[PDB]
Design a binder for this molecule. Structure first.
Ligand SMILES: Nc1nc2c(ncn2[C@@H]2O[C@H](COP(=O)(O)OP(=O)(O)OP(=O)(O)O)[C@@H](O)[C@H]2O)c(=O)[nH]1
Ligand SMILES: Nc1nc2c(ncn2[C@@H]2O[C@H](COP(=O)(O)OP(=O)(O)OP(=O)(O)O)[C@@H](O)[C@H]2O)c(=O)[nH]1
Ligand SMILES: Nc1nc2c(ncn2[C@@H]2O[C@H](COP(=O)(O)OP(=O)(O)O)[C@@H](O)[C@H]2O)c(=O)[nH]1
Ligand SMILES: [Mg+2]
Ligand SMILES: [Mg+2]
Lengths: 426, 97, 431, 429, 215
């Protein structure tokens, strides 16, 4: 009875959601046609959090699908798990954003947001007690960054007493997939700072590095790349669906994770990451699990925490384990690494446990971290922005729409204030 | 602006080309120590896979084996040490009521 | 992971290589079209189309030695862009391989070497085939040595050169060419192996039953002595050596990098019915002057360093017994400053037999790599042959008209006299 | 809902379309009579109730000798009879005759047919205009076409596939006169103008292919392969789909600097392709040489500004960023200081198709880079010199003024191209 | 494994209301005995015969040493050392077959030892109550099946040392205003924490000032 509503805009958000619903449907024993075929009654017990019940035992997800072009939902619908989605919840535009923040925010976004708000108002008022909203988009894209932020702004004005959480894909440090990526990311995260409550930043290069060294996978694809995002995706709302020794919903994490409202930029992680050829030889226990957690190369963002200090750290455990060893090892990992945590907060680690491990793993867990080392991730974006903006590189696709230069300046100013606020607490 | 239909001539919908093989041609000899898929992280094995149970089906937990292993507390049950309501205590109970 | 790049420059190199690659494809299961109906990528590159293209760059400046490769049975097995062909023959002039016509084709050879080495990940040397007598093998090889040693550097390049014999010869300007190609290669090479054709003629006459030999038999023997060098990569043995292992066991000084190469059981098919080819007789069968592949007796010199690679069913127990008795005899000369002398390598792969070839199916075989002080007489005779002709600058008028001046011969003289004095300085002892 | 309307004007345009629409019917299940024996054809082909498929193109030329070949070719049952518009008088290498006298007479028919094709369309987003800068029709009539279309359909992105004149080899004599005017009247109405040179495909077919002595039909197949690589994402799935709108907001920084190039990397014979390993780290590495491009100008004269990569077949993304990360570490490949991002990738999920009896190999990988370089400023400088050496003595002025021209527009397009060269130098500081 | 201990403590507390005994202690004498002052009512809890099903039957468990290992600082449920403070008032509840005599014997031993110290204004100190019923055990339980049980409640001044770190934590947190906006959103003032800290400091002052003597 703490329902959640899933939003996805852009091809990145759609293809991340297409694997998240894979993971959730596998967890709850749901068929591709939309029928339940699991074994236990626990997987049906809080099925209302992610699914909406219909007659005859048919279960429909509470997802809203949108972009500006009909390119990716044709593959999303025609996939293996495309029949579960409601045909009414497919809304779409005509002209692609063309990797433009202006096209997704003022011209086409303004005339498409009304139907997306229609779908969200249809779905949100049917739930018994809405917990919050969940969105997946890409910071470097056109129809994701320009229009998901419009959706955040148009939703936050109507429910001011809920929790907003976004699922972003940060521009990579080395290789760019779009030349207007700083232009399309600075404005998007400028709008993201004042509106959301808890955000999760994902870098593609860190995922490639963790899939090449730890996973020993020389050739992963994008579909296998989205599986780790789905892993850290379903691991944060596991206590809302299953009982545990110590439950923690999304609001409890939001309270324990955000000390000040403008510092809510978190780095997701996943604990039991092994190779295929080294599965027989792992011996999963809590020590090697928490030693694999706080390794700097287990992180899904491009920020190495050694240049910064952790502010607050979350650790949601799942499965059969005892309890002194969890407290003992969050004592230990905080004690010997006191240079990497803050000295003005006595306890930095929030722990939570559940009782039902995932389908086929003995135990599993998810890492969420608020570190002051994320200031370097915004620093390179600010440098690229102030290098492109100084010579007016690609601006005429924005002032050629009806924007202003001063909005670019205030977005860069907000970025500098955010970097200074993260640096000041060090 | 929104369509009713995403298919040709404003009728029905678009069925795209689906890639049969989304994986990668091993141009050289494919390695044995190569972790090609990534759905193996949590795969339930066929037929046999552990369901989700509760505390009474656990071990060393709350409510576990309470009616089964009741012979251990039987010697503390069959002693005549519990207070039996005699005439005067029952009289006080009736006196309040 | 264990790759090696072959460059077959000049006529002698590719006329070795056309039998060498038959040997290589016969030791594996590769058909001559390129299909197989690990342990092959040291010499080949498997492609997604199932073809097995080798890693070789066939280069000659005249076409009449590579077109029969391009129309032969190996036309489907090679890569038809790496078979680099010039237009005019270098024609036994060092000027026409290093200065005039070699410089407009060397860019393509360097580009193909770079493209071949970019695909690899575990390079550990080069296999450069040339000769010290001609114009292409002494002019164009020395041109690309200076490039390969400045664009790769620390890699250990291995070369095979056919040295001019004392008595028999074909060219008459090769005393000029050998000193000219020695002057430039000496500072950009690591370990090159000398072979003389006269010694192979004596070997193929004496303990090999076949008289009237062609060049195919000599090329087969050279291919067998090369295949034993790289037998420790595609086959795993008891004592494995790599290609850069040879670089640090045979070069006492940066100037002295010319060892020889002998194959021990070069015996016939009819005579192999009669001999017990144990490792004890094999180990000292290569030590005789009748089996050395350079016409120089060891007794006037001293064996400065030695390296042996064994093959087939060879147990390492009797190898120690066989190698101990060698340094007990007084005639195998050894001096004070190198007490150890020897190195051993074993493998479990028997030496193969090419059908139609002459070498018999033997099951134990060693090759000896050794640098001796008994090679300074060859340098002395080449020096004498140069200074008898430069008494009145005989053949110089062809060279000076094609790129360089007269002074390039005096620098080569000052190099080779320094090499001679270095050898006789090494030979004497310090009391 | 991602359709394209292809405009083929000029001898070069129609001869290129003869190969492009030969490839298009092969990639789908389209027979040459227009029959398909599950709706990816819709970006180029329509649907009529008997099962007949009719393409969306306008083959228009001013002399009939070329379109009459298509009328009696092997594709005579496929095209619409009306959409093959033809004239009666050739413009005869004259911008004046194709832009003021003959072109204005027939320009209403092609606009009417384009309007009908757009009325059949629902989600049109692009125009594919095929011509050459050389002759009269492809330089004057195409210019009038984009002049009329840019004022009529508004902000629709029209992409232009024009054939640049080589500075050393050229067919006609009046070539600078017919290129300067169309560049002047195109520069404010185009979005992206991909430029291809004739000599630089000749040397590629001599070098990469073992072809000696080729014709135009070998060049048109490579042009068709590149143009199919451009619109590959509208037809097939993939990791990153790139439509025509982000070919337009990504490749051109300034409203005047919109002259990008094209380059197809895995161009090789079907016999050399056996013995060479077609790895993604190799073909991307074998895409930045000066000897593998379709413009003669060496990129070492200037700096790259924005590059876009399109990948077809099983190309997995990490070797893509490994390749273009090794590209960024090369001192030879120089970028500008004001574009730290530089690249853009797009991945598709089908192998490049080969026409039977063709030249290109059967390969599973394909790269098509649409680079935008400063080094094209020299290509304008040499043609500027050719303009100034001819106009100084009025070499062919009377052929133009006698067909509704003046003298002043010759002495304003010179200043327009001087301004364009000044802008090209400005972005390299 | 802790909730069963808390359940055993609470079952020993209300044991007199359930079964007869020699000295039953109702729920009112706990207040009159363990609470001297209206504000000073924060005692400890100690269950001494906590032992496994294997370390129980190797030993005799008399009342002399289950009343002795209980006073050691490694057996109470709050991390505080009783040697720093002074005991105020103590309650012992004996379950099971306990003759009343050796209770007073062990009491006489405990009042003899100088290693623990009391406050001067409590000359009696100890209130005891002997329930006559032994404790019960749980299937799958950690605790052994034993005859004798004791539960101590001890009013000590050493529990103020447990309060001497949480106030320090608040001084560390409140100085940088961390995590305050979650509280002041729903009808809360920034100054409520100030009066809460002043109330806690007043409690610390009370515990400091009770243990002094006026002579
Ligand atoms: N073992 C062996 N030696 C050969 C063969 N062909 C030539 N030679 C030797 O090579 C020597 C001459 O040097 P070459 O390598 O032929 O000269 P080159 O490098 O081809 O120079 P050009 O003839 O000008 O191209 C002769 O003395 C021969 O002994 C061969 O097929 N096998
Ligand atoms: N690459 C390539 N270029 C072509 C082809 N056909 C014609 N050309 C080019 O066309 C130019 C000749 O001028 P055109 O543009 O064809 O003349 P036009 O405007 O079409 O006028 P007409 O030829 O009379 O129809 C030459 O520079 C050729 O390079 C072709 O099939 N392939
Ligand atoms: N991990 C992952 N990243 C993706 C996927 N699809 C797109 N992206 C990322 O999204 C970025 C492109 O922005 P995008 O949202 O697709 O542009 P838009 O759709 O026009 O808004 C690229 O940097 C990609 O790395 C996917 O399936 N998986
Ligand atoms: Mg020759
Ligand atoms: Mg024409």
């Amino acid at each position: 009875m703490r329902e959640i509503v899933h939003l996805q805009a852009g091809q990145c958000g759609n293809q991340i959601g297409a694997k998240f619903w894979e993971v959730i449907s596998d967890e709850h024993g749901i068929d591709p046609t939309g029928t339940y075929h699991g074994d236990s009654d626990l997987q049906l017990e809080r099925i209302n959090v992610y699914y909406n019940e219909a007659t005859g035992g048919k279960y429909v997800p509470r997802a809203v699908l949108v972009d500006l072009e009909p390119g990716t939902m044709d593959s999303v619908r025609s996939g293996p798990f495309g029949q579960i989605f409601r045909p009414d919840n497919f809304v779409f535009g005509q002209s692609g954003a063309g990797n433009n923040w202006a096209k997704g925010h003022y011209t086409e976004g303004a005339e498409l947001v009304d139907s997306v708000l229609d779908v969200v108002r249809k779905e949100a008022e049917s739930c018994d007690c809405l917990q919050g909203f969940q969105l997946t988009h890409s910071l470097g894209g056109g129809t994701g960054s320009g229009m998901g932020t419009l959706l955040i702004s148009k939703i936050r004005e109507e429910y001011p007493d809920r929790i907003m959480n976004t699922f972003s894909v940060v521009p990579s440090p080395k290789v760019s997939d779009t030349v207007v990526e700083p232009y399309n990311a600075t404005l998007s995260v400028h709008q993201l700072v004042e509106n959301t409550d808890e955000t999760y930043c994902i870098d593609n290069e860190a995922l490639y590095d963790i899939c090449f060294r730890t996973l020993k996978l020389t050739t992963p694809t994008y579909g296998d790349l989205n599986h780790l995002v789905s892993a850290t995706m379903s691991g944060v709302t596991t206590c809302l669906r299953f009982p545990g020794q110590l439950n923690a919903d999304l609001r409890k994490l939001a309270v324990n994770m955000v000390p000040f409202p403008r510092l809510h930029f978190f780095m997701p992680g996943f604990a039991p990451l092994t190779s295929r050829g080294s599965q027989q030889y792992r011996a999963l226990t809590v020590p090697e699990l928490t030693q694999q957690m706080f390794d700097a190369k287990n992180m899904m963002a491009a920020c190495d925490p050694r240049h910064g200090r952790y502010l607050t750290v979350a650790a949601v455990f799942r499965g059969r384990m005892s309890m002194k060893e969890v407290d003992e090892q969050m004592l230990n990992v905080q004690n010997k690494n006191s240079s990497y945590f803050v000295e003005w907060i006595p306890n930095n680690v929030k722990t939570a446990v559940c009782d039902i491990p995932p389908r086929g793993l003995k135990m599993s867990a998810t890492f969420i971290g608020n570190s002051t080392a994320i200031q370097e991730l915004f620093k390179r974006i600010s440098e690229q922005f102030t290098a492109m903006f100084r010579r007016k590189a690609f601006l005429h696709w924005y002032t050629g729409e009806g924007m202003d230069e001063m909005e670019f300046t205030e977005a860069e100013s907000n970025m500098n204030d955010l970097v200074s606020e993260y640096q000041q607490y060090q | 602006k929104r369509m009713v239909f995403t298919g040709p001539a404003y009728v029905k919908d678009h069925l795209p080309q689906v890639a049969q093989h989304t994986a990668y041609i091993g141009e050289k000899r494919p390695a044995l120590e190569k972790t090609g898929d990534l759905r193996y992280l949590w795969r339930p094995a066929s037929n046999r896979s552990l369901p989700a149970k509760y505390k009474p089906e656990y071990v060393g937990e709350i409510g576990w084996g309470i009616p089964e292993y009741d012979f251990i507390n039987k010697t503390r049950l069959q002693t005549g040490f519990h207070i039996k309501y005699e005439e005067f205590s029952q009289a006080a109970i009736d006196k309040l009521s | 992971m264990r790759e090696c790049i072959s460059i077959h420059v000049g006529q002698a190199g590719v006329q070795i290589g056309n039998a060498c690659w038959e040997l290589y494809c016969l030791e594996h299961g590769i058909q001559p079209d390129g299909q197989m109906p690990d342990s092959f990528n040291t010499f080949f590159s498997e492609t997604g189309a199932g073809k097995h293209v080798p890693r070789a760059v066939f280069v000659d400046l005249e076409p009449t030695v590579v077109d029969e490769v391009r129309t032969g049975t190996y036309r489907q097995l090679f890569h038809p862009e790496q078979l680099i062909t010039g237009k005019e023959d270098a024609a036994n002039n060092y000027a026409r391989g290093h200065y005039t016509i070699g410089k407009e084709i060397v860019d393509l050879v360097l580009d193909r070497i770079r493209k071949l080495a970019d695909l690899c990940t575990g390079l550990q040397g080069f296999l450069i085939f040339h000769s010290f007598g001609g114009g292409t093998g002494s002019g164009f090889a020395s041109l690309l040595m200076e490039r390969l040693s400045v664009d790769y550097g620390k890699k250990s390049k291995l070369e095979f050169a056919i040295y001019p014999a004392p008595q028999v010869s074909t060219a008459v300007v090769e005393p000029y060419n050998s000193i000219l190609t020695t002057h430039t290669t000496l500072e950009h090479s690591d370990c090159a192996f000398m072979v003389d054709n006269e010694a192979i003629y004596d070997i193929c006459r004496r303990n090999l039953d076949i008289e009237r030999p062609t060049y195919t038999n000599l090329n087969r023997l050279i291919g067998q002595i090369v295949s034993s060098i790289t037998a420790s990569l595609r086959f795993d043995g008891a004592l494995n050596v790599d290609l850069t292992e040879f670089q640090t066991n045979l070069v006492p000084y940066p100037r002295i990098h010319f060892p020889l190469a002998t194959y021990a059981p070069v015996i016939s098919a009819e005579k192999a019915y009669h001999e017990q080819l144990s490792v004890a007789e094999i180990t000292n069968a290569c030590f005789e002057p009748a089996n050395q592949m350079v016409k120089c007796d060891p007794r006037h010199g001293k064996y400065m360093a030695c390296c042996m690679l064994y093959r087939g069913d060879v147990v390492p127990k009797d190898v120690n017994a066989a190698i101990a008795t060698i340094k007990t005899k007084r005639t195998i000369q050894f001096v004070d400053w190198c007490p150890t002398g020897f190195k051993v390598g074993i493998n479990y792969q028997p030496p193969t037999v090419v059908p139609g070839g002459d070498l018999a199916k033997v099951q134990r075989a060693v090759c000896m790599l050794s640098n001796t002080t008994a090679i300074a007489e060859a340098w002395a005779r080449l020096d004498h042959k140069l200074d008898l002709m430069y008494a009145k600058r005989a053949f110089v008028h062809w060279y000076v008209g094609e790129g360089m001046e007269e002074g390039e011969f005096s620098e080569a003289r000052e190099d080779l006299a320094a090499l001679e004095k270095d050898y006789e300085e090494v030979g004497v002892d310090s009391v």
